[PDB]
Design a protein around this ligand. Structure first.
Ligand SMILES: CCCOc1ccc2cc(S(=O)(=O)Nc3ccc(C(=O)O)cc3)ccc2c1
Ligand SMILES: CCCOc1ccc2cc(S(=O)(=O)Nc3ccc(C(=O)O)cc3)ccc2c1
Lengths: 271, 238, 57, 252, 59, 59, 252, 57, 60
């Protein structure tokens, strides 16, 4: 279990014991309980730290991107969409993972794929139920340049085929870093010269997702938008860091704008 | 019926799944197996076999047999560098269309040591000595024979044994490297220098050839299947 | 089959899981591991500091 | 007493007569890489006492308006002895450290410093389109300085203690191995950092394992007629240094 | 969250005596405060933090 | 004092009287301006509930 | 060390880092009244932690010409918390005490105080035909002050340290439980007074069990340019408080 | 697996339940607990009142 | 150290074996054998200078 400490009954004291006094010049932080600073009763305490595990904290699906593509190519979305895999284009999921320096985990990817009708000068629409492909292309694979090209044959590339009006499709991904954990922060460079990309984006090379309609275009236009959700599973995290204080600027840098530590108060004494 | 609930991915077709499906020829009697020589069970049984390396893959030599051989001669000086190329057995021009390199371009990761065998194809009256060098990265390619012998090296002596292996060890920060060229996953440099000279009688040719072979060692593995970039089409073949 | 206690209160209470896949990345997340060791952040000192004694003697 | 300590490494030794214990970061003491965690197959050189031994860095002047100092490692020891020479000739290295900060004062002086070793202390930039350049991340044996207020530039590091040069609360740099030097208590801090990375070994010029930051949280103050020059000296010894991937010198 | 039913009390600091110091040492000093949980402390019910936000995807 | 290092330190001095209150703030470690951007307070703002004792160290 | 101590009573705790032991007056530690020494036949209420807990009194300024201060008990705690409330509603009470005096200074200051708890410290009067009045015996949480030289009045207490306000040698207040606070040694005194009376319980407004007197025997002195305000704070906790004879509030 | 009697008459008759979740809040509601104690509302008196005797003697 | 008891300092006491001359910086002095002396209650600090010699003896 994850059950917390009980309070221990304590009486009056008058001794040379000094639990309250300490030096904080040591890296050590005090271990004092209420049973050291006042009377206290015995409390049998059944509260658990069950949901404050890192495998419950990080284990809820979070949207990491959405990308759009259009049958008509109505508003410059092409007939397929692409996304270079990263976790840093969204504030919320990024912040949770950046409370740790190294994380090894498996992922679970869920896709929520929706479509909508577009304005057109077309008359009479009775468009069949759309099918969509989501193709994962590992680093150094051939890439789509059109919706019709040979790369969508998926002979070794992992791929999902899914039809609208069905449960969101999902696939597990295993741990797959070159290292023995994913690196959230890298204080190095990509060159021995100490030039080029600086930061964690040096070590980012996680392939690219491509997504298209599998159906041929119909006389109107449909735009489909695919939202990608990652959930960490089976997590071990190492080296705790402060939570972010500043809002992010960029998905490849930590650059930040100088921001206040805390919010205002009127004075030292407030009620 | 039995209460059940459908969960995400209930109707998906994942191309890397394995599920059972009804046969469309129930009770079909397959042909008996027989032993056919040369059963493959792994692609590291193909990668551990030598394959001639085109180390002389200049523009004129691509469609000829010049590609697979580098001339070496009796020099009037020490003789400089014979060749050198960045190691990276899946992204280098030199190494990526060999057996090792084309089994590598179906994968995104690789690890382990590989072995470059060299063979002298001169006369039996011709003899030489060569410095075969590997330099781990972070200091660039060696630009002198002095800097090449600070790295890993085998000094090859040409004799009755016609070949010498420079085994190039794994030596990497990460447990794996990317098949693609990536500056974080940089893999070092290979070079060859004259250690002595090719010395030969008057009545035997002053020029000789050298070939290079490459294969995986027994500590070598690959991970993460992907489509190769070396085959393509614009319409269905008919 | 693996039979394991459910999360339940305070002052039946088991569930059954069978894995259906050949990979352990396919498995449901481990949510019932409640091991801790706060002492490597909270007390990362070479000499053991006893609470009742002076920090610095 | 608990205030007196010596640390002997190689042919160097440091003495303290005021210290507030020794912090062993994450409770893990430096050691050589094991055979079950290795991946570099060549024999490692272990120079022992010749590389593991205190190296005193350039001192910094603590002033009343100082906002702090930082040194990145291993790049503050890149020209130091045979530790820096074995960095030149090897692709990989791997070392733990004991970092010892010295800053004595009289009993009529006051001030408080945070001494903290931050793993992977990737830093922001003044301009949000650009990466900070090497000259602004690192000074070598010389420290780079934090500023009290926000700075501007193009490739300059965004320095402003409140953000700690990393976009986080500066008061929260206490989950990292740390000690304080408070002038009315102790005159020295000691942190022992293990090797911490997600790869078992890594190049020593292309990567900085951690950064030592020294940040005044209570300004230096004294009555005029007392000593007005008070240095902070950082003397740091490698521990269990080993290197693989021998080749010619350089790093380009 | 602040809720009037779940009101948690007040913290304060007062002089019990005074800061007494020699002539040649400064009359003003500083005090810092630190905070941490005890070993009886727990939390429940995960939710998004209100301290991080964005108006468009980072690039 | 928000963007400076003044935020983390409260002056205390040799007073010519007893000296009054030095500071005071409502306890509430996840909703108070004082306590909510500390390590304790930012781990609290991913949760809706909390319980247990906490310890304020002063130096 | 013997200089560091904590005393925890109720939800209060005091810390010292300079102290000269604890005096337990007459070698008897506070306790509840026994069944063989009782005479009040109703059940006693014992509020425990709610009344037994340190109560800080109003501080007094130590000056170079100060002649001392006194507080009478239980009438300095008559408005203090639930200790003072249980005095209101009960005919009888009975309590021991731990009295803790605080008075820190620098090492460039000098002075010596006698801290003494005097049982039954009945005091004289300026006029020899009259009794001193309540306003001159007691100030409550505020101290009444001794004077260096003789005073005059009609109902005024005769104050003059030499007589100690009682007509006795002031130097002989050392057979009573006492400690000294000498600024070059300790910054605190602690006396633990048992309940001392010739009746097992007594009314808490009509009678004062003891008086704490604090008398400078070596004047405060320091060189100008040092702190000139030095308080003396008296923080005193009841111990084993119990009460009998519950009725309506008041005392008239 | 838990095997428990069904609700059936008056003058096969079991079902099987397996829990599929790690929480006990996920479980189906308990509908077969028929314990009662009406006496704390119906007879909440300090002295036991015997039916055949006077209420007030 | 024969200062005051309110005076405090730290000093680098160094020995350099020969063949590279005397150290001309504090940087070069700490590449040799050294003891960092911390002035405290203990008023003295020993730099023990080890034998380190090619020969078993040296000339006076
Ligand atoms: C409209 C008239 C016809 O236009 C085209 C245009 C481009 C073509 C490209 C090819 S291919 O690349 O050789 N093979 C493919 C195989 C499978 C897929 C798939 O979608 O799964 C895609 C391509 C084959 C036919 C093609 C017809
Ligand atoms: C129509 C032109 C485009 O307009 C907008 C308007 C507002 C936007 C806000 C954001 S965000 O808040 O940074 N991230 C989100 C992530 C996931 C979801 C989701 O829906 O799951 C929502 C928002 C990103 C793109 C946005 C495009």
């Amino acid at each position: 279990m994850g059950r917390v400490a009980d309070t221990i009954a304590r009486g009056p004291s008058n001794s040379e014991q000094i639990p309250a006094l300490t030096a904080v010049e040591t890296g050590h932080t005090s271990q004092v309980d209420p049973s050291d600073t006042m009377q206290t009763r015995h409390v049998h305490n059944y509260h658990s730290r069950s949901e404050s595990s890192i495998e419950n904290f990080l284990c809820r699906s979070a949207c990491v991107i959405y990308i759009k593509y259009s049958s008509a190519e109505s508003n410059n979305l092409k007939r397929y969409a692409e996304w270079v895999i990263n976790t840093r284009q969204v504030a919320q999921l990024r912040r949770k993972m950046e409370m740790f320096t190294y994380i090894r985990c498996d992922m679970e990817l869920t896709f929520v794929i929706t479509s909508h009708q577009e304005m057109s000068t077309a008359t009479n629409s009775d468009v069949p139920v759309q099918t969509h492909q989501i193709m994962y292309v590992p680093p150094g694979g051939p890439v789509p340049t059109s919706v019709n090209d040979y790369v969508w044959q998926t002979s070794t590339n992992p791929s999902i085929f899914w039809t609208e009006g069905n449960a969101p499709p999902r696939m597990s991904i295993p741990f797959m870093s070159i290292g023995n954990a994913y690196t959230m922060f890298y204080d190095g460079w990509s060159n021995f010269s100490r030039d080029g990309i600086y930061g964690y984006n040096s070590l980012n090379n996680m392939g690219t997702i491509y997504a298209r309609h599998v159906n041929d275009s119909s006389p109107g236009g449909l735009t489909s938008t695919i939202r990608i959700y990652f959930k960490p599973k089976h997590v071990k995290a190492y080296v705790p860091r402060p939570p972010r204080l500043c809002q992010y600027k960029k998905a490849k840098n930590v650059n930040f704008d100088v921001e206040a530590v805390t919010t205002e108060r009127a004075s030292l004494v407030t009620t | 019926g039995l209460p059940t609930m459908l969960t995400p991915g209930s109707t998906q077709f994942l191309t890397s799944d394995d599920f059972q499906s009804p046969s469309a020829m129930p009770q079909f009697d397959v042909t008996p197996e027989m032993n056919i020589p040369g059963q493959v069970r792994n692609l590291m049984e193909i990668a551990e076999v030598d394959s001639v390396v085109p180390i002389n893959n200049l523009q004129a030599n691509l469609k000829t047999m010049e590609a697979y051989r580098v001339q070496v001669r009796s020099t009037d000086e020490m003789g400089g560098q014979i060749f050198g190329f960045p190691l990276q057995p899946g992204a280098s021009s030199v190494l990526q269309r060999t057996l090792l390199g084309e089994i590598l371009n179906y994968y995104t990761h690789w690890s382990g040591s590989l072995k470059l065998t060299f063979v002298f194809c001169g006369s039996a009256m011709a003899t030489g000595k060569f410095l075969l060098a590997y330099s781990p990265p972070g200091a660039g390619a060696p630009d002198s024979r002095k800097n090449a012998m600070l790295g890993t090296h085998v000094i090859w002596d040409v004799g009755l044994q016609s070949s010498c292996v420079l085994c190039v060890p794994w030596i990497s920060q990460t447990h794996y490297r990317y098949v693609v060229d990536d500056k974080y996953t940089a893999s070092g440099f290979i070079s060859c220098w004259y250690q002595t000279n090719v010395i030969v009688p008057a009545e035997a040719q002053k020029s000789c050839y050298i070939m290079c072979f490459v294969s995986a060692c027994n500590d070598f593995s690959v991970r993460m299947l992907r489509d190769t970039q070396f085959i393509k089409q614009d319409t269905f073949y008919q | 089959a693996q039979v394991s206690t459910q999360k339940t209160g305070a002052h039946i209470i088991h569930y059954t899981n069978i894995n259906y896949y050949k990979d352990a990345a396919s498995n449901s997340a481990n949510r019932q591991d409640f091991t801790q060791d706060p002492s490597k952040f909270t007390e990362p000192v070479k000499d053991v500091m006893i609470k009742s004694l002076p920090a610095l003697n | 007493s608990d205030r007196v300590r010596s640390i002997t490494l190689g042919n160097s030794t440091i003495t303290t007569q005021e210290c507030a214990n020794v912090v062993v970061g994450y409770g893990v003491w430096p050691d050589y890489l094991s055979d079950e965690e290795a991946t570099a197959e060549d024999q490692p050189t272990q120079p022992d006492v010749a590389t593991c031994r205190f190296y005193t860095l350039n001192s910094v002047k603590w002033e009343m308006q100082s906002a702090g100092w930082w040194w990145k490692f291993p790049d503050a020891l890149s020209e130091m002895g045979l530790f820096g020479q074995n960095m030149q000739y090897h692709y990989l290295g791997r070392s733990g450290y004991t970092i010892h900060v010295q800053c004595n004062a009289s009993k009529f002086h006051q001030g408080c410093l945070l001494v903290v070793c931050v793993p992977e202390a990737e830093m922001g930039c003044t301009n949000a389109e650009n990466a900070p350049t090497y000259g602004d991340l690192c000074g070598g044996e010389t420290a780079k300085q934090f500023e009290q207020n926000a700075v501007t530039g193009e490739t300059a590091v965004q320095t402003a203690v409140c953000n700690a040069g990393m976009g986080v609360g500066v008061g929260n740099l206490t989950i990292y191995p740390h000690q304080w030097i408070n002038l009315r208590t102790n005159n020295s801090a000691t942190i022992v950092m293990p090797y911490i990375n997600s790869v078992p070994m890594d190049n020593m010029f292309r990567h900085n394992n951690f950064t030592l930051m020294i940040i005044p949280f209570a300004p230096l103050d004294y009555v005029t007629g007392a000593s007005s020059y008070i240095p902070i000296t950082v003397t740091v010894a490698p521990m269990s240094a080993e290197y693989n991937g021998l080749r010619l010198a350089g790093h380009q």
